[PDB]
Amino acid sequence: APTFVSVAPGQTARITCGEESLGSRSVIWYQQRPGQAPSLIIYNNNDRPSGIPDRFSGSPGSTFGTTATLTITSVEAGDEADYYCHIWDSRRPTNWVFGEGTTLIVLSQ
Amino acid sequence: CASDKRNVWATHACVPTDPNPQEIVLENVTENFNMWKNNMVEQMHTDIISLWDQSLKPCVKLTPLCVTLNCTNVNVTNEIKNCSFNITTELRDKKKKVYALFYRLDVVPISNYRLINCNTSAITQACPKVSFEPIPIHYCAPAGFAILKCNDKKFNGTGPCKNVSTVQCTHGIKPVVSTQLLLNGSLAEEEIIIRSENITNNAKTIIVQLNESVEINCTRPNNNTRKSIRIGPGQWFYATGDIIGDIRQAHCNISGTKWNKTLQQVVKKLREHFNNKTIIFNPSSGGDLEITTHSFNCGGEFFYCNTSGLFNSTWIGDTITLPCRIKQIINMWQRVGQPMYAPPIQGKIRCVSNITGLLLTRDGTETFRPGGGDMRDNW
Amino acid sequence: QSLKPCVKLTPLCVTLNCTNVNVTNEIKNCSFNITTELRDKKKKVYALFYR
Amino acid sequence: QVHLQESGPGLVKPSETLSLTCNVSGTLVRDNYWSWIRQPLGKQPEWIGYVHDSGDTNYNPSLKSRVHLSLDKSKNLVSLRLTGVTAADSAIYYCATTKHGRRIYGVVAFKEWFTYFYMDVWGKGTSVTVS
Ligand SMILES: *[C@@H]1O[C@H](CO)[C@@H](O[C@@H]2O[C@H](CO)[C@@H](O[C@@H]3O[C@H](CO[C@H]4O[C@H](CO[C@H]5O[C@H](CO)[C@@H](O)[C@H](O)[C@@H]5O)[C@@H](O)[C@H](O[C@H]5O[C@H](CO)[C@@H](O)[C@H](O)[C@@H]5O)[C@@H]4O)[C@@H](O)[C@H](O[C@H]4O[C@H](CO)[C@@H](O)[C@H](O)[C@@H]4O[C@H]4O[C@H](CO)[C@@H](O)[C@H](O)[C@@H]4O[C@H]4O[C@H](CO)[C@@H](O)[C@H](O)[C@@H]4O)[C@@H]3O)[C@H](O)[C@H]2NC(C)=O)[C@H](O)[C@H]1NC(C)=O
Ligand SMILES: *[C@@H]1O[C@H](CO)[C@@H](O[C@@H]2O[C@H](CO)[C@@H](O[C@@H]3O[C@H](CO[C@H]4O[C@H](CO)[C@@H](O)[C@H](O)[C@@H]4O)[C@@H](O)[C@H](O[C@H]4O[C@H](CO)[C@@H](O)[C@H](O)[C@@H]4O[C@H]4O[C@H](CO)[C@@H](O)[C@H](O)[C@@H]4O)[C@@H]3O)[C@H](O)[C@H]2NC(C)=O)[C@H](O)[C@H]1NC(C)=O
Ligand SMILES: *[C@@H]1O[C@H](CO)[C@@H](O[C@@H]2O[C@H](CO)[C@@H](O[C@@H]3O[C@H](CO[C@H]4O[C@H](CO)[C@@H](O)[C@H](O)[C@@H]4O)[C@@H](O)[C@H](O[C@H]4O[C@H](CO)[C@@H](O)[C@H](O[C@H]5O[C@H](CO)[C@@H](O)[C@H](O)[C@@H]5O)[C@@H]4O)[C@@H]3O)[C@H](O)[C@H]2NC(C)=O)[C@H](O)[C@H]1NC(C)=O
Ligand SMILES: *[C@@H]1O[C@H](CO)[C@@H](O[C@@H]2O[C@H](CO)[C@@H](O)[C@H](O)[C@H]2NC(C)=O)[C@H](O)[C@H]1NC(C)=O
Ligand SMILES: *[C@@H]1O[C@H](CO)[C@@H](O[C@@H]2O[C@H](CO)[C@@H](O)[C@H](O)[C@H]2NC(C)=O)[C@H](O)[C@H]1NC(C)=O
Ligand SMILES: *[C@@H]1O[C@H](CO)[C@@H](O[C@@H]2O[C@H](CO)[C@@H](O)[C@H](O)[C@H]2NC(C)=O)[C@H](O)[C@H]1NC(C)=O
Ligand SMILES: *[C@@H]1O[C@H](CO)[C@@H](O[C@@H]2O[C@H](CO)[C@@H](O)[C@H](O)[C@H]2NC(C)=O)[C@H](O)[C@H]1NC(C)=O
Ligand SMILES: *[C@@H]1O[C@H](CO)[C@@H](O[C@@H]2O[C@H](CO)[C@@H](O)[C@H](O)[C@H]2NC(C)=O)[C@H](O)[C@H]1NC(C)=O
Ligand SMILES: *[C@@H]1O[C@H](CO)[C@@H](O[C@@H]2O[C@H](CO)[C@@H](O)[C@H](O)[C@H]2NC(C)=O)[C@H](O)[C@H]1NC(C)=O
Ligand SMILES: *[C@@H]1O[C@H](CO)[C@@H](O[C@@H]2O[C@H](CO)[C@@H](O)[C@H](O)[C@H]2NC(C)=O)[C@H](O)[C@H]1NC(C)=O
Ligand SMILES: *[C@@H]1O[C@H](CO)[C@@H](O[C@@H]2O[C@H](CO)[C@@H](O)[C@H](O)[C@H]2NC(C)=O)[C@H](O)[C@H]1NC(C)=O
Ligand SMILES: *[C@@H]1O[C@H](CO)[C@@H](O[C@@H]2O[C@H](CO)[C@@H](O)[C@H](O)[C@H]2NC(C)=O)[C@H](O)[C@H]1NC(C)=O
Ligand SMILES: *[C@@H]1O[C@H](CO)[C@@H](O[C@@H]2O[C@H](CO)[C@@H](O)[C@H](O)[C@H]2NC(C)=O)[C@H](O)[C@H]1NC(C)=O
Ligand SMILES: *[C@@H]1O[C@H](CO)[C@@H](O)[C@H](O)[C@H]1NC(C)=O
Ligand SMILES: *[C@@H]1O[C@H](CO)[C@@H](O)[C@H](O)[C@H]1NC(C)=O
Ligand SMILES: *[C@@H]1O[C@H](CO)[C@@H](O)[C@H](O)[C@H]1NC(C)=O
Ligand SMILES: *[C@@H]1O[C@H](CO)[C@@H](O)[C@H](O)[C@H]1NC(C)=O
Ligand SMILES: *[C@@H]1O[C@H](CO)[C@@H](O)[C@H](O)[C@H]1NC(C)=O
């Protein structure tokens, strides 16, 4: 089920989700540290909650025919976490299951 | 006629106009006019029907599509159906399964559905290169005849005109097709003019000519894709393919304050024919969609807008948004048995029209409802 | 001119199954297959024809 | 700071009712939306349903007849009652607060919008095995 990426610390990671966008979307991104509950990184495509740095941003929900994208710049060792992605879409039925995640492997520990 | 590609209203059966038409004022001439007995109206109505019918002759019949459709809503929304069906290809011994989107108003239930007119007549698709955008048509007199024009600013439609001029021909008249509201016509110069054959009857319509326009902004927000399906040997059918983006409802926007000023003025002048009674405006009473809604051709698509948001008020001593429906199979000029299929137009559609008048009818406090689908009242 | 604006019977040029089961103890009772308004559907119908 | 503590039996028998409790502190139960989430080991998490006051409650259709969510205003507790547990329910369960907002794409008068939900505050969760 999972996808893997491997990024050296200081490099940019690219994580994607799901199927192609059909209509307007609101993508919610979560970060899960092994052994811990997941937490929210981004809601509404690009609105991050307080405590989340500007290194986390993603694709707009205004486009169609594309996939969800999370960009993590300047990846730190502290970003070695799995990533989950919950997609809301105006044409698809409500998704009750978060999509399959992508594990971010951070090098040179 | 006289006039000035492949527009449906430009079949070139008629001559070009004179770049500098003449008008001669006839001094001291009083002439009795009666717009309700005018035979130029019958002449125009007949010519308009013919231009339309001639234009639809040289193109594809959709008789081959009268097959059972399998229609679902599997991938459109979380009024538009996704239908699969079998068609022939250019070879008579071969068939293939195809998909198309159809609007609910064009499809009726009976392998579940049928096109709405397959038990009545053959459906001709509009020839795809033909534009429906109106072109002004001038009507000009033959030898031995003359056209007289009435220049009285307050002329309602009947009786003597004290300022009469002779013209070689009429101004250009745009063959705009609409129902409840008259679009893109001429404005009155001094005041709103309310005119009817008999203002005290119920069987007669009232044409209200405004001296100010009200803009109506209409749109079709869905990004439709046109798909081309081969039905026969050089015969293509144009189907709606997938919708890109959100599924949204078509609509029209009328400013709230302009509409209200317009009604204050219409009512003020209506109380000059009726006693000082309460005047109420209601939505039309019912019947066919072509009567109950405001229909028009915008960008080539056929809209049916709900005007209950306009004609809903009581008169005594923001933006209005009207939802609209879109149809592809239509029956113009109330002719039963001669349906036409309008191919989908790719991309988004927007048009801005001018409301220049209203068509009102009295119900049996006075009650007025919008309406009248008889095109002669527009002309 | 009068016969132009109406129905052709080309679709009836099909094989007919004609009998005399219920007419007399010159008119035949014929059954045949025709299409309906849908091009993918056919039905069996009956009609009387003169010999 | 909202803290969500969780407990449960740890071990539940098959074809039995599982009841998990989320102890809410730092906020009141009556003032927010609550969600239950579960994560089978090795899998992406599933949103069970959400519960709130005013009847604004909904459930994952696969659990439509198996899950009852409720809020105890007096004890300020959030809880899950899952009935008829099976091997597929052997997951870590989490309690979380929920926030929501509206995505508008068209005319609001025609309801061309939708409500989306997200979970900001998560508890530690509790591991449940169905034997
Ligand atoms: C007839 O008249 C009627 C009525 O007048 C017309 O109806 C209108 O039709 C239009 C479109 O047809 C609708 O437009 C959409 O509106 C929504 C809502 O925006 C309004 O509300 C915003 C704030 O509300 C939200 O946040 C507050 C915060 O508290 C919250 O309380 C509230 O509940 C709600 O959640 C305002 O900010 C916004 O104003 C902003 O935009 C204005 C645009 O012109 C600008 O002038 C202002 O100065 C200001 O900047 C407005 O008041 C819009 O969100 C929506 O636009 C988004 O979605 C479309 C479709 O997907 C997309 O194309 C757009 O690009 C945009 O998507 C971006 O923003 C999303 C916000 O969540 C984000 O989620 C997306 O991922 C994406 O984000 C990316 O770009 C942004 C750019 O800023 C960037 O910041 C991000 O980081 C990222 O890069 C449309 O504009 C009208 O709502 C509708 N009106 C009504 C009343 O229905 C009708 O069209 C007329 N018909 C005719 C024929 O004329
Ligand atoms: C795909 O399509 C489906 C089906 O249309 C859609 O699911 C529906 O989503 C809507 C929107 O979230 C849900 O509507 C809410 O319903 C609750 C009550 O519903 C329950 O009770 C009814 C009773 O018959 C049951 O039928 C139903 O099944 C449920 O059991 C309402 O309380 C909600 O109202 C609040 O939210 C609205 C906006 O979402 C506000 O406009 C409204 O004012 C209310 O908010 C206010 O009050 C809140 C509580 O006091 C407060 O917290 C807020 O801050 C605010 O003050 C709302 O009507 C609907 O139930 C869903 N299910 C069904 C079967 O319709 C999917 O969402 C859609 N998915 C996508 C991605 O488009
Ligand atoms: C009342 O009076 C009003 C004012 O006259 C009318 O509103 C006007 O209505 C007309 C017709 O609907 C609108 O004109 C259309 O505008 C479209 C958009 O043009 C814009 O973008 C263009 C991009 O290139 C740009 O060049 C324009 O300057 C403008 O910015 C046009 O696309 C459309 O073109 C049509 O006619 C062309 C003639 O050559 C033809 O080539 C076009 O072909 C395109 O589309 C077809 C569709 O199948 C494709 O197959 C082709 O490959 C190609 O893509 C197309 O057929 C046309 O110019 C006008 O804009 C609008 N005015 C306003 C203010 O909006 C009202 O409608 C009248 N009321 C009533 C009831 O009639
Ligand atoms: C009678 O009608 C004629 C025709 O419309 C009016 O003549 C026009 O007057 C305007 C005023 O500037 C001129 O610009 C036009 O060029 C004139 N038209 C022609 C054909 O000459 C005339 O003014 C009207 N008379 C009255 C008393 O209303
Ligand atoms: C009409 O379309 C529906 C679309 O759902 C067909 O129903 C099922 O569609 C799914 C799509 O993957 C198939 O896997 C199923 O096998 C279909 N059902 C059956 C019984 O085969 C439906 O069959 C279609 N009917 C016709 C006459 O085309
Ligand atoms: C052809 O089929 C259409 C659609 O079924 C028939 O139209 C319906 O006719 C009934 C008659 O009472 C009306 O009540 C329905 O409202 C009509 N439906 C629609 C969509 O308008 C039509 O009458 C049939 N024609 C023939 C000759 O049988
Ligand atoms: C349009 O104006 C004409 C001319 O004034 C009106 O015609 C008169 O109507 C009254 C009604 O009682 C008659 O008594 C007059 O004899 C009519 N005059 C002529 C010359 O026929 C006409 O009624 C007005 N139209 C409307 C709708 O009010
Ligand atoms: C809709 O009404 C507006 C005015 O409210 C028209 O715009 C102007 O009309 C005058 C008429 O003499 C022209 O001289 C102006 O040049 C027009 N304005 C512009 C910017 O050209 C508008 O043309 C009307 N639309 C229709 C379809 O009649
Ligand atoms: C205009 O309409 C009015 C109202 O229908 C006509 O007046 C009616 O004429 C009939 C004739 O049989 C009388 O029975 C009604 O009692 C009259 N009604 C009223 C209110 O008087 C009027 O004659 C029509 N005028 C024209 C020129 O057609
Ligand atoms: C409606 O959809 C079409 C098709 O997606 C958009 O037109 C372009 O289509 C080409 C086909 O390769 C793409 O490469 C372009 O990128 C599309 N345009 C854009 C801006 O991305 C069309 O633009 C859409 N219409 C609207 C109004 O968005
Ligand atoms: C219909 O569309 C027209 C033009 O697209 C709108 O006219 C504009 O209105 C804004 C309002 O602030 C003005 O600032 C612009 O200068 C106007 N443009 C022009 C060319 O005049 C009109 O308001 C729209 N009508 C509705 C009901 O929304
Ligand atoms: C135009 O829209 C109005 C509402 O915006 C429609 O009126 C509703 O019709 C339904 C049909 O049963 C009634 O149940 C509602 O109570 C009506 N609403 C109101 C406010 O009375 C109207 O039918 C639509 N007309 C057309 C021609 O589509
Ligand atoms: C005409 O407008 C009035 C209000 O201006 C509409 O009255 C509403 O009727 C509905 C019926 O269920 C009520 O629920 C609303 O609360 C009423 N609104 C107000 C402000 O009282 C009336 O329905 C409109 N008529 C049509 C046909 O749409
Ligand atoms: C098209 O023809 C095939 C032939 O078997 C049939 O199975 C299929 O159902 C037909 N499609 C429709 C929509 O009738
Ligand atoms: C379509 O066919 C199915 C077959 O069971 C039937 O259940 C359904 O009601 C039909 N729908 C229509 C519009 O006839
Ligand atoms: C239209 O008629 C009304 C009637 O009073 C008048 O007040 C208004 O100024 C007139 N508008 C124009 C453009 O003459
Ligand atoms: C239109 O005029 C009426 C008069 O009673 C008023 O009540 C209504 O609010 C006005 N509408 C607008 C858009 O001002
Ligand atoms: C009509 O078609 C059926 C299809 O099997 C056939 O059996 C029947 O004989 C045909 N009827 C006639 C009169 O040919």
Residue numbers in the entry:
A (entry chain L): 6 to 9, 11 to 67, 67A, 67B, 67C, 68 to 95, 95A, 95B, ...
B (entry chain A): 54 to 57, 65 to 138, 153 to 184, 189 to 309, 312 to 321, 321A, 322 to 359, 361 to 397, ...
C (entry chain B): 114 to 138, 153 to 178
D (entry chain H): 1 to 82, 82A, 82B, 82C, 83 to 100, 100A, 100B, 100C, ...
Q: What did the article's authors report about this structure?
A:
The HIV-1 envelope glycoprotein (Env) trimer is metastable and shifts between different conformational states, complicating its use as a vaccine antigen. ConM is based upon the sequence of all group M isolates and stabilized by an SOS disulphide bond, whereas ConS is a SOSIP—UFO combined design of a group M consensus soluble trimer. To interrogate the effect of EDC cross-linking we carried out cryo-EM analysis of trimers bound to PGT12232 Fab fragments, and solved the structures of unmodified and cross-linked GMP versions of ConS at 3.1 Å and 3.45 Å resolution respectively, and unmodified and cross-linked GMP ConM at 3.4 Å and 3.85 Å respectively.
